[PDB]
């Protein structure tokens, strides 16, 4: 049926800038057309309505415009709070239908992660199970490569990654890598390590432990 | 105020049905009507359809008529979704959201929403893991649980800042999160560090203190 396209999918922009954002609509829905703001973990919330009309208590620097199939959202001199997801939605009879949404997030400068590793548990071994963990913590921007390396060869099986949200005090993201391996496989091999590759450097981060040390 | 209370999480087999509630209070029950809106972990939002309690009226998304069922019930101003037929695809958050004056206004009062996780996996407690090595760095690792959510805390709240607690990830029908504290090096081990795991499934509580090895 009716179709909703937002871009960008994401925006970096920084506290003080103006920002715009579109939703273009697969056919003719006049000036019915709204935005939702929702924040990590929050429910959404509406700001716009009939494309130009603010909710109740939405601050004016939030501004709506366009008609017929194409339509923006003009936020002027962001604020921190003004960071996270938006979306679009006709609203021109039914059915409904929403934009995939346009994810705006802070810019900083690049940030190196800081990084450590955590051989297995004792405790863990005792149940026959060997997780490896390795936190990159506070790097900017979001893009990174982690690899794990048993006596220097790649290990790809049983990698569980986990990349954090946007950190709102300090505008940069966390990854937690475990690499998971039985105990007696663990117990065959000395030398582990992570290995970060990001932006910031042209060499990898490594962090490396032997096992009998 | 306008308040939509939303029945809890809920974890069901593929193939079953599951019912949610959403009673309202604050406004006049009957006057506005109530929209469904689904919300799969990561990704937009998509519209499901309406009921208006006055007389129990419904417009559905017709992607979900024959799937999901709207009801109401007017003295105890609560609506109810129902979903038959589960598969994993309906593993999501769903919202009751109530409308404006007319139905196709856009949409102001959004409720926290119901998290429905479709699952052939047994409920499952977690094993927790510590995470000991100017600034040190320790974790919990939380492993093995079946559903979502766990809580982790830090000397029960008081460690706030330097955390990151990272999101869970799925690997064969089991949960694995992992949570960093990054606390002053002097400190550590003299004050006691922590981690406080709930999981509220399988009503375990785990209290882990991070030792030096």
């Known amino acids: 049926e009716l179709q909703m396209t937002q871009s960008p999918a994401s925006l970096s922009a920084s506290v003080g800038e103006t920002v715009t954002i579109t939703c273009r609509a697969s056919?003719?829905?006049?000036?019915?057309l709204a935005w939702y703001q929702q924040k990590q973990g929050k429910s959404p919330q509406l700001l716009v309505y009939?494309?130009?009309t603010l909710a109740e208590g939405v601050p004016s620097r939030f501004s709506g415009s366009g008609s017929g199939t194409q339509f923006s959202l003009k936020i002027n001199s962001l604020q921190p709070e003004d960071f996270g997801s938006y979306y679009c939605?006709?609203?021109?009879?039914?059915?409904?239908?929403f934009g995939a949404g346009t994810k705006l997030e802070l810019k900083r400068a690049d940030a190196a992660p800081t990084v450590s590793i955590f051989p297995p548990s004792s405790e863990q071994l005792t149940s026959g199970g060997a997780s490896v963990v390795c936190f990159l913590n506070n790097f900017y921007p979001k893009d990174i490569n982690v690899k794990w390396k048993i006596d220097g060869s790649e290990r790809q099986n049983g990698v569980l990654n986990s990349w954090t949200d946007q950190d709102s005090k300090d505008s940069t993201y966390s990854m937690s890598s475990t690499l998971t391996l039985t105990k007696d496989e663990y117990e065959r091999h000395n030398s582990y390590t992570c290995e970060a590759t990001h932006k910031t450097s042209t060499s990898p981060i490594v962090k490396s432990f032997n096992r009998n040390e | 105020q306008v308040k939509l209370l939303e029945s809890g999480p809920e974890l069901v087999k593929p193939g079953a049905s599951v019912k949610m509630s959403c009673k309202a209070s604050?406004?006049?029950?009957?006057?506005?009507?109530m929209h469904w809106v689904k919300q799969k972990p990561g990704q937009g939002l998509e519209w499901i359809g309406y009921?208006?309690?006055?007389?129990?009226?419904?417009k559905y998304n017709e992607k979900f008529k024959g799937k999901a069922t709207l009801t109401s019930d007017k003295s105890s101003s609560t609506a109810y979704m129902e979903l038959s037929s589960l598969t994993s695809e309906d593993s999501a958050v769903y919202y009751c959201?109530?409308?404006?004056?007319?139905?196709?206004?856009?949409?102001?009062?959004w409720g926290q929403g119901t998290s429905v996780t479709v699952s052939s996996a047994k409920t499952t407690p977690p094993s927790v893991y510590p995470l000991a090595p100017s600034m040190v760095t320790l974790g919990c690792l939380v492993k093995g649980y079946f559903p979502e959510p766990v809580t982790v805390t830090w000397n029960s709240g008081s460690l706030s800042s330097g955390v990151h607690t990272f999101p869970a990830v799925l690997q064969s029908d089991l949960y694995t999160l992992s949570s960093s504290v990054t606390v002053p090096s002097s400190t550590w081990p003299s004050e006691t560090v922590t981690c406080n795991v709930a999981h509220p499934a399988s009503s375990t509580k785990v209290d882990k203190k991070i030792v030096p090895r």
């Open positions: 056919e003719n829905i006049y000036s019915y």
């Open positions: 009939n494309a130009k």
């Open positions: 939605q006709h609203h021109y009879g039914t059915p409904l239908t």
């Open positions: 959201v109530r409308g404006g004056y007319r139905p196709y206004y856009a949409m102001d009062y």
């Open positions: 009921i208006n309690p006055y007389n129990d009226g419904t």
């Open positions: 604050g406004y006049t029950f009957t006057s506005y009507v």
